[PDB]
Ligand binder design. Structure first.
Ligand SMILES: O=C(O)C[C@@](O)(CC(=O)NCCC[C@@H](NC(=O)C[C@@](O)(CC(=O)O)C(=O)O)C(=O)O)C(=O)O
Ligand SMILES: [Fe+3]
Ligand SMILES: [Zn+2]
Ligand SMILES: [Zn+2]
Ligand SMILES: [Zn+2]
Ligand SMILES: [Zn+2]
Length: 288
């Protein structure tokens, strides 16, 4: 037997050539596998299978939950006897050793990665599986759709945007170095957050997700906003209190009718080729 050496975030990992059983510890690595018609046996899916977007979910089929992304359950991982574990370079720094005792571990950008880096992690997975060819063609299909949709989005690009989650209790802004933000940058948009106001702002779980006081909100006064939510009725008790707040009402985007509410699973959690493809289709349909 032999190996394929692959550069992960730490350094060169030795992945078995025959790698058949894969545990993945972020949704985005589950999207990468699906796009190479490879199906993992384990997913850290927060116990919530529906957080795996539709085209991925049905292309993966039936798998085993290894628990939360934040705290993957090591005995369920072990029992699955994976030939390879794809872990997040941010989320799982602390279980990296204990993952390697189970199986050779590829630590990659996901949670703290912007749009390009997540795509870089996809290429790394494809090389590790020896599917470079499929990988390039899928990306070539990807680079086409995205740019196609980019040419059809009828929003004016000069109206700066703030993408945010209203966390519980929020707000969390997604800057230019978040997945959403850069993806919007790649589509032509300018983040309302300047690459200098973000200087401070505390981070959420070490990722590019930045706590904003309602007064930071008013100061930057974005011209467009994109609020990511998990509520099917796009309601949220949390968000409705923000909409009553006098200082929210005075925002430029609120007053010029340019607030779009979208699905957080799809926009923020997924971080895959398919999910960006839905994000860009949406934005064409929202542009009208
Ligand atoms: O999860 C992602 O990949 C990305 C992202 O964390 C990005 C984001 O803007 N985060 C704001 C969420 C703040 C919110 N916390 C949760 O809801 C729990 C959790 O975040 C846990 C986790 O992630 O381990 C979860 O997602 O289940 C709170 O209560 O204040 C996101 O959730 O959209
Ligand atoms: Fe989260
Ligand atoms: Zn402030
Ligand atoms: Zn101020
Ligand atoms: Zn609701
Ligand atoms: Zn809620």
């Amino acid at each position: 037997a032999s190996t394929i050496s692959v550069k992960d975030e730490n350094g060169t990992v030795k992945v078995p050539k025959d790698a058949k059983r894969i545990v993945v510890l972020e949704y985005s690595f589950a999207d990468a596998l699906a796009a190479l018609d490879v199906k993992p046996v384990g997913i850290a899916d927060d116990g919530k299978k529906k957080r795996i977007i539709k085209p991925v979910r049905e292309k993966i089929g039936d798998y085993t939950s290894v628990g939360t992304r934040k705290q993957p359950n090591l005995e369920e991982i072990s029992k699955l006897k994976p030939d390879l574990i794809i872990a997040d370079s941010s989320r799982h720094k602390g279980i990296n050793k204990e993952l390697n005792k189970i199986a050779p571990t590829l630590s990659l950008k996901s949670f703290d990665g912007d749009y390009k880096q997540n795509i870089n992690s996809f290429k790394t997975i494809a090389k590790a599986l020896n599917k470079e060819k499929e990988g390039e063609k899928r990306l070539a299909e990807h680079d086409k759709l995205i740019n196609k949709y980019k040419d059809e989005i009828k929003f004016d690009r000069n109206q700066k945007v703030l993408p945010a989650v209203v966390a519980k209790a929020g707000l969390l802004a997604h800057p230019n170095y978040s997945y959403v933000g850069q993806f919007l940058n790649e589509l032509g948009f300018k983040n309302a957050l300047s690459d200098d106001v973000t200087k401070g702002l505390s981070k959420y779980l070490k990722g590019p997700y930045l706590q904003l006081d309602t007064e930071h909100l008013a100061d930057l006064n974005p011209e467009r906003m994109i609020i990511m939510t998990d509520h099917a009725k796009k309601d949220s008790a949390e968000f409705k209190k923000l909409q009553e707040d006098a200082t929210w009402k005075k925002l430029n985007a609120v007053k010029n009718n340019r607030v779009d509410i979208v699905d957080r699973d799809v926009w923020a959690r997924s971080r895959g080729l398919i999910s960006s493809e839905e994000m860009a289709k949406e934005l064409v349909e929202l542009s009208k």
